[PDB]
Amino acid sequence: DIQMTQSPASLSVSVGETVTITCRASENIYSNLAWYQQKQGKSPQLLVYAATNLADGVPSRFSGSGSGTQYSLKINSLQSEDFGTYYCQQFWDTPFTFGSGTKLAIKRADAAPTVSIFPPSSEQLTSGGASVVCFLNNFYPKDINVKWKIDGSERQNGVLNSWTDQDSKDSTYSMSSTLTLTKDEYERHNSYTCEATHKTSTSPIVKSFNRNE
Amino acid sequence: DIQMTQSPASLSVSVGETVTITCRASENIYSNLAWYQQKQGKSPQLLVYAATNLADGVPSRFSGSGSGTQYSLKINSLQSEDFGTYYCQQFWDTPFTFGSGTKLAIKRADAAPTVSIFPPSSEQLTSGGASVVCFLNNFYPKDINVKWKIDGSERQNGVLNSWTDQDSKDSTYSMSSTLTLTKDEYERHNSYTCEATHKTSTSPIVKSFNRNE
Amino acid sequence: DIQMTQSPASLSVSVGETVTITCRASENIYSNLAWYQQKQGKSPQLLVYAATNLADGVPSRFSGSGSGTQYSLKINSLQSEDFGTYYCQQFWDTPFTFGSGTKLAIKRADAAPTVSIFPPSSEQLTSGGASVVCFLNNFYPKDINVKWKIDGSERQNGVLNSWTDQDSKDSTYSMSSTLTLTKDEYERHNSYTCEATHKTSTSPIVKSFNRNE
Amino acid sequence: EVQLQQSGPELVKPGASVKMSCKTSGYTFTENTMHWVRQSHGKSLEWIGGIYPKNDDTKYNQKFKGKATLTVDKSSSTACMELRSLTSEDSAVYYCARGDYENYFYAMDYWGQGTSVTVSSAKTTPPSVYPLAPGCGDTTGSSVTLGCLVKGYFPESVTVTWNSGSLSSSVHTFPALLQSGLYTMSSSVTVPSSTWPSQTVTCSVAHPASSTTVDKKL
Amino acid sequence: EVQLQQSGPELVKPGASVKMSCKTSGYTFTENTMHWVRQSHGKSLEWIGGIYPKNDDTKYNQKFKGKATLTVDKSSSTACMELRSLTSEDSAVYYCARGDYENYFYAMDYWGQGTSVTVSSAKTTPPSVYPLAPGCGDTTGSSVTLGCLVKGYFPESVTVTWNSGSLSSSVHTFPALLQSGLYTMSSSVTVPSSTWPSQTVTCSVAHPASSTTVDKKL
């Protein structure tokens, strides 16, 4: 079974620049390529097929090219409606295989995240558990590392976060925190710290809270 | 074992001009080329592979091309961050072989060197030796020939010099002199002369010193 | 033995125009071409080799191309330092053969020659001979035909002339005359005429001299 | 997204052995080959050999086949190469970079930090600076230049300081020089004639390895 | 970076032999082939033959195979070719230029200085100038022109001087001319009518080889 790999995985670029994405096959098909554009929550749409010819309803800004194994797709010049994931396909042998996908975002400038930490309330203790939340907002880029320091130690498992997709005018992201711990193990320690290492500052800011505060 | 030779060895060019470097293989690989960029004291980075396709994160100013044995790399238009050595590789047969390297500097105008000659002091004679130093600074280009005239004769071996790499704003070089001779053979002659033949003047300037001066 | 012929033999062109010179081989080499530039009284220098790739130190204004037998060299755009003869070479079979050469001059406007005729003096008659000289200067182009009318007849052999190469600012030519005849045959006739047919005037100007004048 | 961290610079006497380490992340370690590259002076590069980290697959250069070995630990991710019977010309910076999926071809994309390896039998000696001052009695021209000289230091390197870091503009640096198994330093500073006789500058050179800081009054 | 220095121009009578020398530097001498090229008049070029300086490897042109030999000294770097049974049409400038590594193809990059070789049986004679002055009694037109003539000189060449080098603008030069084994010179100078009758110019021609300087009053 032929496999394909695309590079890069996530390409961030502003409006008006040329973008070249690649697709590589393990075997030489020569005849078969299909590039797709899938918007968020939408069905895929065909752009260029047979590695060269563009499909119907596709603007002339998309020019694909290639031969043998290695293939490419060039976008000039990028517009505001072209953001989305891209895929590549082979027609040559069953099964038909697809690439891993390439996310195309809009490039922005540096932005500092909004740090938020709040202690848990007294209502959830009735159900036999407690959850503390840590939120960050308006941060770019999406590269981040979460760190929870409890008595100078890390706890696993049970530490995971979620994010929001790119906005339109703001075009930033957001975070969330969900931690699963019962009620009697919340009072065994005191110092709780939410740390996030980002490239804005060399030293991550520190914010902590206590029990009776 | 296939060998490769690059030309030229050192190419000096200012900012904004096209640069074409070549790589030649003894046998015809057809499939395999890799151009690298190694800055000063840094690890190499891949630019264009497979003789045509540019790698990820590489700007679009670099276009490689070639077929058969002889290959080439074209840079248009040159920027200020692109200075460094370049290499070429074959994937075809073991061992994988690399080129000799091509240094890319920044082109400047003519500059006269700063001549410096100083006699040795009395402290090093306690250790049983004596060393006289001759320094030149702010000279372009790097082509030079050192000449030591003692009683109208040349002495070998023991005459060698060192240099400094290209600066940022000044973008010039420097020299140094280290001569190994013991204390009792320093007083057997008198006239000592440091000569350097450069293309600024047809007749190299002459500066000498004596014992009791 | 493969032979090569270049066209044209002499190509006159001003500064700033494209020049295409050709080289043709009797057999199909496919792999081998070398174009040379030899200035006046200087050693040849390699420009483009392998019919395509330009050599080191050669400016980018020279682009060679070709395949099979017929080859070409295109110069755009011509500069003031590029004047000189050009050659073409084959690497394919021994002996290595060279073309006939192509002279590249600078194009000028029409210019009228300076007519000069002087009778011989009385000093050379002591050695047993006499020589009359006819000079022309500041003439363009170099196409000319010399005519010596003595009693309405032409004499051969012994009529030959020399020329001077192209100047820098003036960029014109010059002529000379050397005629070998002894002393006793100089007095057998009287009317002597130096004629030169040039394209400035349909009727060449006539200037003659006599014995006792 | 892909980081390769090597060990630190290592010094050893000739005849012994050395073992490096190359640790990576960001990708499946068993699905990508790794190669080793040595850089000698000045720009010269060579290819040591590759490794395929599934069970073992090895390809050595015919010249380096006997002087180098390649082992890979598949549990904790690392790549280690060992050298036998070291000599003077075997001292070079060594690179480790990832290859292509299921392939030794498709030249390495991401590289390492280039840990250096030096081999010398000389004993570490504290450095001793040297005075450089005018002169023959007549100063020419209007630019009065001077410098420093350091002898008897090992290994690299030392630091340069002028008046506690007063002016960094006219100070220059130079690599070492090999004479009789020992090295040397030099410097040059371009100063007008408005300093001497009035103002006086001193030279200070500190050696971080031997913790030797010598201040000489020029 | 690569310099090729040849010998000086040489003159010999027909029937004898001559040996040139080509010295190079800047590269390993044993790893690059060398070729010889002759330039006859006007632009015509021919290919003598190549040499591979490891032990010996030789390729001659079938026409020049008997009239030329090629030897190489591998200790001191030189390339020498010897010619047997010289004649009149064998006088030409000879070139020596380096080839390609392990190959006779890939046309020569760097060339030599083009040492000339001339063959003549004539004896060196001191030159004698010739007067050229007006005239028939009526000068026309407003530009009064004149020149010089030199006869009985050998070998090339002589120098031209006008009023100790007063005006270099209107002076012209001409090559020699072959008549009865001897050569000749000529010159032309464009001057208005404001010189003669008032100012008078003289001709002076010096021969560096024979040390003969003759000054003729025109």
Side-chain angles (χ1 to χ4, degrees):
Chain A
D1 291 344
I2 300 169
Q3 65 179 21
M4 289 180 178
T5 59
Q6 293 177 336
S7 296
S10 178
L11 189 148
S12 64
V13 62
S14 63
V15 176
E17 293 82 357
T18 60
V19 176
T20 59
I21 60 173
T22 59
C23 182
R24 179 181 294 177
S26 64
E27 296 177 351
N28 192 336
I29 52 181
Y30 299 99
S31 178
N32 304 132
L33 182 63
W35 290 97
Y36 293 139
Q37 184 175 355
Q38 182 175 355
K39 294 181 180 298
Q40 183 64 260
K42 302 299 183 181
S43 64
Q45 295 300 321
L46 177 62
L47 272 61
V48 56
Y49 62 90
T52 179
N53 292 336
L54 58 83
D56 291 344
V58 176
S60 63
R61 293 177 294 102
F62 298 157
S63 296
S65 64
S67 295
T69 60
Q70 295 176 337
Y71 292 137
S72 178
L73 175 62
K74 185 185 293 179
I75 294 171
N76 57 343
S77 178
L78 179 62
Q79 295 301 321
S80 64
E81 70 281 4
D82 292 344
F83 62 92
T85 187
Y86 296 140
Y87 300 134
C88 54
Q89 181 176 355
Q90 64 177 17
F91 314 161
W92 179 252
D93 186 4
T94 299
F96 298 159
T97 58
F98 296 157
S100 63
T102 298
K103 294 183 175 74
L104 189 147
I106 303 301
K107 183 180 67 64
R108 297 179 66 250
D110 187 4
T114 299
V115 61
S116 297
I117 292 100
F118 297 96
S121 179
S122 178
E123 289 84 357
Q124 75 286 0
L125 296 175
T126 301
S127 63
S131 296
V132 62
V133 295
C134 182
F135 295 98
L136 276 68
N137 298 131
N138 191 30
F139 60 91
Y140 178 81
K142 63 179 68 180
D143 181 67
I144 193 66
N145 189 340
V146 62
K147 182 173 178 290
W148 290 93
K149 182 173 178 290
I150 179 169
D151 290 345
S153 64
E154 296 301 321
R155 62 183 181 276
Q156 295 85 1
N157 57 33
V159 175
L160 58 82
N161 297 131
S162 178
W163 291 272
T164 301
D165 59 353
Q166 186 174 355
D167 189 4
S168 63
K169 179 62 174 172
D170 189 6
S171 177
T172 58
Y173 299 139
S174 295
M175 296 178 184
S176 63
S177 178
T178 299
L179 298 175
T180 60
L181 59 83
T182 184
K183 61 188 182 71
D184 61 354
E185 64 184 343
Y186 177 78
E187 295 300 322
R188 65 185 181 91
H189 293 167
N190 189 30
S191 178
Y192 298 137
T193 300
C194 181
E195 291 300 321
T197 299
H198 194 277
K199 270 68 180 180
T200 57
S201 63
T202 59
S203 178
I205 59 173
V206 176
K207 183 180 172 63
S208 296
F209 62 91
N210 289 283
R211 296 180 183 174
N212 291 337
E213 293 178 350
Chain B
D1 291 344
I2 300 169
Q3 65 179 21
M4 289 180 178
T5 59
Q6 293 177 336
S7 296
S10 178
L11 189 147
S12 63
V13 62
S14 63
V15 176
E17 293 82 357
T18 60
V19 176
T20 59
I21 60 173
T22 59
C23 182
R24 179 181 294 177
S26 64
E27 296 177 351
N28 192 336
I29 52 181
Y30 299 99
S31 178
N32 304 132
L33 182 63
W35 290 97
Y36 293 139
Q37 184 175 355
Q38 182 175 355
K39 294 181 180 298
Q40 183 64 260
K42 302 299 183 181
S43 64
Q45 295 300 321
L46 177 62
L47 272 61
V48 56
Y49 62 90
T52 179
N53 292 336
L54 58 83
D56 291 344
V58 176
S60 63
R61 293 177 294 102
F62 298 157
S63 296
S65 64
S67 295
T69 60
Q70 295 176 337
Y71 292 137
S72 178
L73 175 62
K74 185 185 293 179
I75 294 171
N76 57 343
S77 178
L78 179 62
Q79 295 301 321
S80 64
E81 70 281 4
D82 292 344
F83 62 92
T85 187
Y86 296 140
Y87 300 134
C88 54
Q89 181 176 355
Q90 64 177 17
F91 314 161
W92 179 252
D93 186 4
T94 299
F96 298 159
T97 58
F98 296 157
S100 63
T102 298
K103 294 183 175 74
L104 189 147
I106 303 301
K107 183 180 67 64
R108 297 179 66 250
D110 187 4
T114 299
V115 61
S116 297
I117 292 100
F118 297 96
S121 179
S122 178
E123 289 84 357
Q124 75 286 0
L125 296 175
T126 301
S127 63
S131 296
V132 62
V133 295
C134 182
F135 295 98
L136 276 68
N137 298 131
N138 191 30
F139 60 91
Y140 178 81
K142 63 179 68 180
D143 181 67
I144 193 66
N145 189 340
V146 62
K147 182 173 178 290
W148 290 93
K149 182 173 178 290
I150 179 169
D151 290 345
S153 64
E154 296 301 321
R155 62 183 181 276
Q156 295 85 1
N157 57 33
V159 175
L160 58 82
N161 297 131
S162 178
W163 291 272
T164 301
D165 59 353
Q166 186 174 355
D167 189 4
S168 63
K169 179 62 174 172
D170 189 6
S171 177
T172 58
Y173 299 139
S174 295
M175 296 178 184
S176 63
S177 178
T178 299
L179 298 175
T180 59
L181 59 83
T182 184
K183 61 189 182 71
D184 61 354
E185 64 184 343
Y186 177 78
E187 295 300 322
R188 65 185 181 91
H189 293 167
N190 189 30
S191 178
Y192 298 137
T193 300
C194 181
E195 291 300 321
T197 299
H198 194 277
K199 270 68 180 180
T200 57
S201 63
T202 59
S203 178
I205 59 173
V206 176
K207 183 180 172 63
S208 296
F209 62 91
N210 289 283
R211 296 180 183 174
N212 291 337
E213 293 178 350
Chain C
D1 291 344
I2 300 169
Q3 65 179 21
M4 289 180 178
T5 59
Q6 293 177 336
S7 296
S10 178
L11 189 147
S12 63
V13 62
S14 63
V15 176
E17 293 82 357
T18 60
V19 176
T20 59
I21 60 173
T22 59
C23 182
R24 179 181 294 177
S26 64
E27 296 177 351
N28 192 336
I29 52 181
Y30 299 99
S31 178
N32 304 132
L33 182 63
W35 290 97
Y36 293 139
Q37 184 175 355
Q38 182 175 355
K39 294 181 180 298
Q40 183 64 260
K42 302 299 183 181
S43 64
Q45 295 300 321
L46 177 62
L47 272 61
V48 56
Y49 62 90
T52 179
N53 292 336
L54 58 83
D56 291 344
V58 176
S60 63
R61 293 177 294 102
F62 298 158
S63 296
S65 64
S67 295
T69 60
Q70 295 176 337
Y71 292 137
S72 178
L73 175 62
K74 185 185 293 179
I75 294 171
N76 57 344
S77 178
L78 179 62
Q79 295 301 321
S80 64
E81 70 281 4
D82 292 344
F83 62 91
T85 187
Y86 296 140
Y87 300 134
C88 54
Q89 181 176 355
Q90 64 177 17
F91 314 161
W92 179 252
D93 186 4
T94 299
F96 298 159
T97 58
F98 296 157
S100 63
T102 298
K103 294 183 175 74
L104 189 147
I106 303 301
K107 183 180 67 64
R108 297 179 66 250
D110 187 4
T114 299
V115 61
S116 297
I117 292 100
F118 297 96
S121 179
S122 178
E123 289 84 357
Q124 75 286 0
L125 296 175
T126 301
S127 63
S131 296
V132 62
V133 295
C134 182
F135 295 98
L136 276 68
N137 298 131
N138 191 30
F139 60 91
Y140 178 81
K142 63 179 68 180
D143 181 67
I144 193 66
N145 189 340
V146 62
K147 182 173 178 290
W148 290 92
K149 182 173 178 290
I150 179 169
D151 290 345
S153 64
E154 296 301 321
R155 62 183 181 276
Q156 295 85 1
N157 57 33
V159 175
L160 58 82
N161 297 131
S162 178
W163 291 272
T164 301
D165 58 353
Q166 186 174 355
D167 189 4
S168 63
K169 179 62 174 172
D170 189 6
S171 177
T172 58
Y173 299 139
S174 295
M175 296 178 184
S176 63
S177 178
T178 299
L179 298 175
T180 59
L181 59 83
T182 184
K183 61 189 182 71
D184 61 354
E185 64 184 343
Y186 177 78
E187 295 300 322
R188 65 185 181 91
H189 293 167
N190 189 30
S191 178
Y192 298 137
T193 300
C194 181
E195 291 300 321
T197 299
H198 194 277
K199 270 68 180 180
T200 57
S201 63
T202 59
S203 178
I205 59 173
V206 176
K207 183 180 172 63
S208 296
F209 62 91
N210 289 283
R211 296 180 183 174
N212 291 337
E213 293 178 350
Chain D
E1 62 184 343
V2 175
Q3 295 83 0
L4 277 69
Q5 294 178 336
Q6 296 177 337
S7 296
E10 187 278 337
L11 188 148
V12 64
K13 294 181 181 297
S17 296
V18 63
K19 182 180 67 64
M20 292 177 69
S21 178
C22 184
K23 182 173 178 289
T24 187
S25 63
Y27 63 90
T28 300
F29 177 78
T30 60
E31 298 304 321
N32 294 130
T33 61
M34 293 179 71
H35 303 291
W36 291 93
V37 173
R38 62 181 295 273
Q39 185 174 355
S40 63
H41 299 290
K43 300 292 183 291
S44 62
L45 289 171
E46 294 301 321
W47 180 84
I48 303 299
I51 189 69
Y52 175 72
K54 183 180 172 63
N55 54 346
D56 55 351
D57 183 66
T58 300
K59 291 185 70 66
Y60 291 141
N61 188 339
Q62 63 180 19
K63 183 173 179 290
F64 297 156
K65 182 180 67 64
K67 291 181 295 297
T69 59
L70 296 176
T71 58
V72 172
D73 185 4
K74 62 180 180 296
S75 63
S76 64
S77 177
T78 188
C80 55
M81 69 178 287
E82 185 277 337
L83 280 69
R84 293 182 295 102
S85 65
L86 294 175
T87 185
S88 64
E89 68 278 5
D90 288 345
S91 296
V93 296
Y94 297 140
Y95 296 137
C96 56
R98 60 179 294 273
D100 181 66
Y101 176 79
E102 296 300 322
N103 192 26
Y104 290 139
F105 303 158
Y106 179 76
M108 299 172 284
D109 290 344
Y110 300 139
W111 289 82
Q113 64 180 19
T115 295
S116 178
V117 174
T118 186
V119 175
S120 178
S121 178
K123 180 62 174 172
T124 59
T125 300
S128 296
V129 297
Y130 176 76
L132 178 62
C136 296
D138 181 67
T139 183
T140 186
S142 178
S143 295
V144 176
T145 187
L146 58 82
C148 307
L149 189 147
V150 177
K151 180 61 174 172
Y153 65 91
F154 178 82
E156 295 85 356
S157 178
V158 297
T159 59
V160 294
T161 300
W162 290 92
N163 297 131
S164 296
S166 64
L167 58 85
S168 296
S169 296
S170 64
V171 61
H172 296 165
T173 187
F174 297 95
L177 278 69
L178 177 63
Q179 293 86 1
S180 65
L182 275 67
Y183 296 138
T184 188
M185 292 294 182
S186 63
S187 178
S188 296
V189 175
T190 59
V191 174
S193 295
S194 63
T195 298
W196 179 258
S198 62
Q199 293 84 0
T200 300
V201 63
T202 187
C203 187
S204 63
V205 175
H207 185 196
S210 296
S211 296
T212 299
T213 299
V214 176
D215 186 4
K216 180 59 166 60
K217 180 62 174 172
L218 296 175
Chain E
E1 62 184 343
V2 175
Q3 295 83 0
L4 277 69
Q5 294 178 336
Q6 296 177 337
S7 296
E10 187 278 337
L11 188 148
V12 64
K13 294 181 181 297
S17 296
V18 63
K19 182 180 67 64
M20 292 177 69
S21 178
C22 184
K23 182 173 178 289
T24 187
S25 63
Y27 63 90
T28 300
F29 177 78
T30 60
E31 298 304 321
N32 294 130
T33 61
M34 293 179 71
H35 303 291
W36 291 93
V37 173
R38 62 181 295 273
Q39 185 174 355
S40 63
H41 299 290
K43 300 292 183 291
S44 62
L45 289 171
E46 294 301 321
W47 180 84
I48 303 299
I51 189 69
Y52 175 72
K54 183 180 172 63
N55 54 346
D56 55 351
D57 183 66
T58 300
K59 291 185 70 66
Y60 291 141
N61 188 339
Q62 63 180 19
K63 183 173 179 290
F64 297 156
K65 182 180 67 64
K67 291 181 295 297
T69 59
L70 296 176
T71 58
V72 172
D73 185 4
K74 62 180 180 296
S75 63
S76 63
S77 177
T78 188
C80 55
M81 69 178 287
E82 185 277 337
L83 280 69
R84 293 182 295 102
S85 65
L86 294 175
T87 185
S88 64
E89 69 278 5
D90 288 345
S91 296
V93 296
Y94 297 140
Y95 296 137
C96 56
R98 60 179 294 273
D100 181 66
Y101 176 79
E102 296 301 322
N103 192 26
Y104 290 139
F105 303 159
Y106 179 76
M108 299 172 284
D109 290 344
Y110 300 139
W111 289 82
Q113 64 180 19
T115 295
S116 178
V117 174
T118 186
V119 175
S120 178
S121 178
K123 180 61 174 172
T124 59
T125 300
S128 296
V129 297
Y130 176 76
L132 178 62
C136 296
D138 181 67
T139 183
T140 186
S142 178
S143 295
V144 176
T145 187
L146 58 82
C148 307
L149 189 147
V150 177
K151 180 61 174 172
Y153 65 91
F154 178 82
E156 295 85 356
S157 178
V158 297
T159 59
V160 294
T161 300
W162 290 92
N163 297 131
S164 296
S166 64
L167 58 85
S168 296
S169 296
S170 64
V171 61
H172 296 165
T173 187
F174 297 95
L177 278 69
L178 177 63
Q179 293 86 1
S180 65
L182 275 67
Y183 296 138
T184 188
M185 292 294 182
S186 63
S187 178
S188 296
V189 175
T190 59
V191 174
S193 295
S194 63
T195 298
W196 179 258
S198 62
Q199 293 84 0
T200 300
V201 63
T202 187
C203 187
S204 63
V205 175
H207 185 196
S210 296
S211 296
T212 299
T213 299
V214 176
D215 186 4
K216 180 59 166 60
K217 180 62 174 172
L218 296 175

